[PDB]
């Protein structure tokens, strides 16, 4: 009947209040955020957009990730404002640039080309990738065929199916970043232990953006052969906090007892982004058990 779209907007505003309340536990605000991401619409976009006020770089970058995945052009102005806001952490600005790419609307090409020259290397790289993704979409007439993951990725998977040839492409520092990302998503889609370990070798090369992406796709693939390397990266205090956070999230997704021990080990880490990732990951495991 017609009460459906009243009930949903009530639930949206309620969840929204939970998200923007800085006194709610972080795991509760993540839960609100991902529910809004699923529900979608203008109310949802506004409440997510309102949370960019927050102190947590972890939370703010998830906001931007969610707006990207929502693929709703209504988010574009807010994501531009985040991308341009030089006071935002690199991780946050990177995520807003990627999100502009994910929405796939060419209206944003000119800004993405501009920010391909941003002084913050994560941002520059992210926007280079997003310009190539927009160019790909334009040449192919839309998103690639749906693969095994429902995510909207920063690059379409490479056509090559041989894992060994994909590994070579991934680890080649002379190839363009976009081509390397394509081989990375093809590895993830190939699956199995050989591809998991080939991916995990990428935790020792490229830029910090590249390594973080490796972390994310290892968390999506969820293959346990990668745990030791994900836990070792998490443990490396010299590693970039954005990479260590992504590794922690991956460990969170896999959620095997050994992942859970590594996350507890780092729950008092000095890097706020790393502590909060471990918190949220452990809290989700506790929820599930309950
Ligand atoms: O982006 O971590
Ligand atoms: Fe990211
Ligand atoms: Fe991240």
Curated annotation (Swiss-Prot):
Pathway: Protein modification; eIF5A hypusination. Catalyzes the hydroxylation of the N(6)-(4-aminobutyl)-L-lysine intermediate produced by deoxyhypusine synthase/DHPS on a critical lysine of the eukaryotic translation initiation factor 5A/eIF-5A. This is the second step of the post-translational modification of that lysine into an unusual amino acid residue named hypusine. Hypusination is unique to mature eIF-5A factor and is essential for its function. Changing residue 62 to A: Loss of deoxyhypusine monooxygenase activity. No effect on iron-binding. Transmembrane segments: none annotated. Changing residue 61 to A: Loss of deoxyhypusine monooxygenase activity. Loss of iron-binding. Gene3D superfamilies: Leucine-rich Repeat Variant (1.25.10.10). PANTHER family: DEOXYHYPUSINE HYDROXYLASE, PBS LYASE HEAT-LIKE PROTEIN. This is Deoxyhypusine hydroxylase. GO terms for cellular component: cytosol. InterPro entries: ARM-like (IPR011989), ARM-type_fold (IPR016024), Deoxyhypusine_hydroxylase (IPR027517), HEAT_type_2 (IPR021133), PBS_lyase_HEAT (IPR004155). Its EC number is 1.14.99.29. The modification N-acetylmethionine is found at residue 6. Its cofactor is Fe(2+). The gene is DOHH. Fe cation 1 binds at residues 61, 245-246. The keyword Repeat applies. Optimum pH is 8-8.5 at 37 degrees Celsius. HEAT-like PBS-type repeats lie at residues 59-85, 92-118, 179-205, 210-236, 243-269. It catalyses: [eIF5A protein]-deoxyhypusine + AH2 + O2 = [eIF5A protein]-hypusine + A + H2O. It is linked to Neurodevelopmental disorder with microcephaly, cerebral atrophy, and visual impairment: An autosomal recessive disorder characterized by global developmental delay, intellectual disability, facial dysmorphism, and microcephaly. Keywords: Acetylation, Disease variant, Hypusine biosynthesis, Intellectual disability, Iron, Metal-binding, Monooxygenase, Oxidoreductase, Repeat. Belongs to the deoxyhypusine hydroxylase family. It comes from the Eukaryota. Binds 2 Fe(2+) ions per subunit. One of its GO terms (biological process) is peptidyl-lysine modification to peptidyl-hypusine.
